[PDB]
Amino acid sequence: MTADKKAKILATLGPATRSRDDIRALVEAGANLLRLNFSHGDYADHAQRFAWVREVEAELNYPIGVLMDLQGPKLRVGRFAAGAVQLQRGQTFTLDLSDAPGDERRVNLPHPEIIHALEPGMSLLLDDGKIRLEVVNCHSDAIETRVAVGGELSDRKGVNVPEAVLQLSPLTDKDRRDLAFGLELGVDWVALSFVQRPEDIDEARGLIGDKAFLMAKIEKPSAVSAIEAIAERADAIMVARGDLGVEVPAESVPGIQKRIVQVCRQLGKPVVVATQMLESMRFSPAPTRAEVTDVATAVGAGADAVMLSAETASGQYPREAVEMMAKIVRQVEAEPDYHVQLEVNRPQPDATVSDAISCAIRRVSRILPVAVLVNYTESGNSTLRAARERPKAPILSLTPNLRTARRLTVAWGVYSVVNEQLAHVDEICSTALDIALAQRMARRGDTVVVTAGVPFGRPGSTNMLRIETVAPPL
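Structure for Pyruvate kinase, as requested:
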């Protein structure tokens, strides 16, 4: 494995991927994680692709994580007798629970927990926000509305409510079946949809158990408001830009994205920027200038992971999509301004031993040419803290456990290597050092840094550091 780029690339798996060898090509182009979209495919396809990925992980011998993306609830409108009713601007329209076929005056909304708690003067978006509805006055059975934007409204079209926060669980009965199937498979990362309350993480975490880590998808304003809270209760955050763009002013979004990456980097939780990264590539072998800029912004904010969806899952050029993504990340890293750029975002360390060690690590790195930070853990949580600081040297996380390594694959600039636990810091000096020549990271004569827990026990914060030089293996 070569550390060409520190930012991570999660690549979706879909119909276009169709070989055990296809997955190998994607990671050979710098893809770090692999995503199975449970809104599509059937379990035979996922289970097949999952296994294909696990062959490649064993063949290359370096841990590559697998992320399973829950569909979440889908909020759709009822049926129309006409089928296509042409709604006109500024006219009154209602929607019931009852299955009255649509007549330009009323359609049903099968899911009634939307109807409850909707207040007058809230907007209602249909057909991916194409039409805006204004609620004039409500009842228990129906909502009277005024059309604020009109257009053809086909049946079973999609509904969005940006203002309201709904008492509805982000776990659908379909999502629960998906959860039991992916946990059985051995997925590492579960991405949760429709997150609007921090409590929604707890319900998913209880079902997940310690079997897998959980990532919260910021898709509603509801979540963005409570981002700080949500980011604390989960293991990582994914920004679905496209999906907010429905529920907020587009011009607002890059601000929200920019803000959220900050909240995550404060807490050290990995942050993933996703959706509309390089869509031009689905059909074209090179991106548009605008896209490269969109990517470079996300990479530059210091975000840990970037997600490619259609470009790899179903697309005429899925490898070169990754090839480009990696090249853009390398170009951002190449810029000398970028290293200084990150510095302002870097939260000043808190008065703890683990922060001080990481802080001391910075000074030592200015004074000496440090080729690798080599923090060693099993729980991952230390290497997460070592990554918060965003060092210029690559982290080489050493692992007595495969499960943590696959999860650490999302983390910023963290490269994980797996071996039998050796249990002692002063002993592992040679091992950590040899591992470096093993993973071909440091030349004979570079200096490396090792950090670990003090008693090699569950006591916390990894509070010792030790410089070592690779003297000539004559």
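Residues 84-160 form a domain with the M1 Pyruvate Kinase; Domain 3 fold (CATH 2.40.33.10).
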